[PDB]
Assembly symmetry: C3
Homo-oligomer: 257 residues x 3
């Protein structure tokens, strides 16, 4: 009676334990299914993160490098200086220490300063720059080069300049510099006392002097002609006197007899 019932009790306890263990196995399976999802998720994330690392490293190597250097492959500077400063509206500043303070200006070169509107500065009042390899200008608003200035000034007539920089204006020596002379052509007639005289004008002045001589001359030729005419009158009077005397001498000789 007591034992048979206790055996049944144990048998039911075993039954319930078997069910509990099966329930526990099921829980382990449910957990494992989540761990499987997590393991897979981790795998997906490892891939995505190494893919982003690569993309970030490429961004770093490229555009990162232009930030720190301030240069691209085609716009380069070699400098430790302070940033360029495009201060003015629509200004452009190129090079460390450069400052384009004025509207629509360009400061070009390290430490260049553009402080007037609509200009391109290639330096400053303390450091200027020559501009080199400039081809001869053609259009009116092209820059001119030294060779063009030299060609344009060749043949220019100049005074001598003294050592102190003053010009000696009191003499203008023409000619080749070794004894040669220069003919000055296309000269107008002098009007003021200190104007140069031209050749037509010289010739005209000789002709005036000769005309004055003729005017004086012909006054004396009138006197000389008056003397010439009077002289013929005297000659006729003499011939008449000689004739008279001949007749007197003949008359006296006939009185003699």
């Amino acid at each position: 009676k007591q034992i048979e019932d206790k055996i049944e009790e144990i048998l039911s306890k075993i039954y319930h334990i078997e069910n509990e263990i099966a329930r526990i196995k099921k829980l382990i399976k449910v957990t494992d299914a989540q761990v499987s999802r997590n393991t897979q998720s981790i795998t997906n994330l490892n891939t995505q993160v190494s893919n982003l690392d690569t993309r970030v490293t490429n961004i770093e190597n490229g555009i990162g490098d232009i930030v720190t250097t301030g240069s691209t492959k085609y716009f380069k500077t070699n400098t430790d200086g302070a940033d360029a400063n495009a201060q003015g509206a629509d200004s452009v500043a190129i090079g460390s220490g450069s400052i384009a303070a004025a509207e629509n200006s360009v400061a070009l070169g390290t430490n260049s300063v553009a402080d007037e509107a609509n200009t391109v500065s290639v330096g400053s009042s303390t450091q200027q720059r020559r501009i080199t390899n400039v081809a001869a200008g053609v259009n009116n608003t092209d820059a001119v080069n030294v060779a063009q200035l030299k060609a344009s000034e060749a043949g220019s007539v100049r005074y001598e300049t003294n050592a102190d920089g003053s010009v000696n204006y009191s003499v203008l020596n023409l000619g080749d510099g070794s004894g040669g002379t220069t003919r000055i052509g296309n000269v107008s007639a002098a009007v003021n006392d200190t104007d140069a005289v031209n050749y037509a004008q010289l010739k005209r002045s000789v002709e005036e002097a000769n005309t004055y001589t003729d005017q004086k001359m012909g006054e004396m030729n009138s006197k000389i002609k008056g003397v010439e005419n009077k002289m013929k009158q005297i000659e006729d009077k003499i011939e008449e006197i000689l004739s008279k005397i001949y007749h007197i001498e003949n008359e006296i000789a006939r009185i003699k007899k």
Copy 2:
């Protein structure tokens, strides 16, 4: 009691199988924990990696800010809202908003600058030009020329004055600009009417006038000599007439007696 011993055997059999399942379950739990331990570590690694990517990405975001939006690096800067630069020509360079380097191997420098001819650098356009400032005097033949250099080519030279119309070619004023005059040396003798004459020619021309005067004096001297020739003849005839009369007067007086 046969049923009781049968049930005891059944109980023991069930217990053996339960004990076996418990051992299997304990192994299963360990398999799961080992994977969970791996996943936990994988997650900690991913947290660290993602945190690092975040910092590398934030640093890049800080660096590229002004470069993408303002188109400017620390040494290449512009202050503008306008249209992109446009390097259209092969090997061209365009710097500044609205700039257009249209032609081959050209450079458009500055906001709205336009380069429309091959192998040129434009500092502006036909709608807006720019002076170039802080240019040091050119030395090489292909260096640019500054205003100082042009002014120095003018200084000390002989130049026509301008009107304001522009150059007045009708007068060339020499001298020092304050009353002083200029002696012009090495001047060749004038050939054409409009050539400047030299002092040698002036002197010769005075000599010609005086020679002309001397010639006319000579003509008058000969007319006079001719008059004095007839005059001496007259003088001799008179002396002879006077003599005749003396002899007549004496002859008449002797007749009187």
Copy 3:
């Protein structure tokens, strides 16, 4: 019944140990489940983080576009496939493929431009130069000069002619306006030397000298004519006297006739 009661006690003890094992197992499973929840959550968070990073990186890549590959920003641009610019000199600047700023504080501007002297801006090289265009006329002494300015300056210039070989022809200086007009030369001093230009005052004095010579000479001629006129008047008086004598002789002879 005592052999059986013993086996029953033994069985109850086995069940006790099994119960204790099962309770230990449920505790372990609770512990694992808690860690799995933390992991699941951490993964969800990571998924969002990583997706946000993806978007930020993509937006970076799109912001840049081709700034790296073409070396150009929206405002500093070149169209070229050549070698990198090279700013070699201290404080130098190089702009354009193949450009080389070799010298200190220099600027090489444009494709293949070379700056090889200090403190210069080169717009080309010894083998390829460039004109500089749309330059407004210089005002300041250190402003660049344009072609219009050079031409205006040259137009006011007095110049000898240049031969084809570049020598200057000093033998002729042609003034005038180019067509056929002439130039009056002002502020000229009196000539001293035979090859000096003469001025108008000097011409006028020369005319005076000549006129004076004429007056002196004609005065001397006038004196000579006067001298002849006087001697002619002497002859006239002698004749009048001779005529008078003859009148008296003729009257005297007539009185002798009676």
